Design a protein around this ligand. Structure first.
Ligand SMILES: COc1ccc(C(=O)O)cc1
Ligand SMILES: [Ca+2]
Length: 119
């Protein structure tokens, strides 16, 4: 669920406030359309598409599904107890949190005008 994703982010990018990723580029946050503006926004585009794919699983609600995971000693793990929905959603979130850690953060690309820039 979103709260768990935030915690993944807080654990893999402890240098930034997590809210730095909640409104970035065309794809990080409420947004989901347009050309991704940079490598970090590409991470979010793949995460958004991963959620749309997980939605196809019956009863699977990526913002709300509580999965089982651990963040310890620099590593994220999706646990074995997870059903198919939980395992997909946890995987979407783990891979995005890892991608976030590896991508440049461009202040300019924070809180961009989606209507105008993401058609
Ligand atoms: C916790 O930060 C985020 C990041 C991306 C999204 C999303 O693109 O759905 C939601 C919350
Ligand atoms: Ca999005």
């Amino acid at each position: 669920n979103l709260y768990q994703f935030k915690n993944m982010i807080q654990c893999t990018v402890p240098s930034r406030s997590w809210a730095d990723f909640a409104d970035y580029g065309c794809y990080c946050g409420k947004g989901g359309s347009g050309t991704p503006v940079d490598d970090l926004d590409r991470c979010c585009q793949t995460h958004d598409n991963c959620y749309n794919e997980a939605e196809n699983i019956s009863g699977c609600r990526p913002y709300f599904k509580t999965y089982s995971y651990e963040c310890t000693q620099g590593t994220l793990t999706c646990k074995g107890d997870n059903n198919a929905c939980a395992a997909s959603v946890c995987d979407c979130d783990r891979l995005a949190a890892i991608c976030f850690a590896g991508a440049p953060y461009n202040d300019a690309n924070y809180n961009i005008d989606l209507k105008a820039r993401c058609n």
